[PDB]
Amino acid sequence: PEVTDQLEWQSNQPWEQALNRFWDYLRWVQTLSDQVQEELQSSQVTQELTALMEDTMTEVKAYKKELEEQLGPVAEETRARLGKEVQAAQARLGADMEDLRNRLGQYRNEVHTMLGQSTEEIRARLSTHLRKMRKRLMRDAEDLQKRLAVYKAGAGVSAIRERLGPLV
């Protein structure tokens, strides 16, 4: 990924793809297979989840700043509100990712309290809770995508023509 994709319709692609890597990793975790379980005690899962969450947030932030720079003419008041809303939606998304990572840390800690033994009971509660948070994350990510779409706005053929000329 040595270059940043710059096609006009692909401006949301970097954050959404970062989000997708997060979601794929999570669907793997959700199986709670014998290999997932070990790797969760080994702190690889939460470290990797954490790298994926962070990269999502970095691409959401780059994208919001890019939209805000390509916005307008627009009333200050409305840029302020459209920004307000993106920020709020972003935050919900981060909160949901934190809850995931943190639930997985709680599970690792409960297993440490049992000296590396897991039970069916606590695996089943983890399983159930992950699914519910995964679904909440989808909803909030869809909400963030909608907030960003609204923001992509502001003001085009005129500008292009003034580059092409003939200009007098």
Binding positions for heparin: 133-136
Query: Rounded to whole angstroms, how far apart are CA atoms 68 and 87?
Result: 12
Rg (CA), the chain: 21
- What determination technique applies here? X-ray
Please tell me what DSSP assigns to residue 154. Answer: -
CB atoms within 10 A of CB 95: 13
Distance of CA 74 to the CA centre of its chain: 28
Q: 40: closest CA among 109, 133, 134, 139?
A: 109
The interaxial angle of helices 120-151 and 44-69, nearest 10 deg, is 10
Domains and CATH numbers, the chain: 1-168 (1.20.120.20)
Is the Cα dihedral 83, 138, 34, 110 positive or negative?
A: positive
Binding positions: 133-136
Buried b (16+ CB within 10 A) or exposed e, 36-56: ebebbeeeebbeebeebbebb
Q: Angle at Cα 68 formed by Cα 65 and Cα 69, nearest 5°?
A: 85
Structure tokens at 87: 């920020």
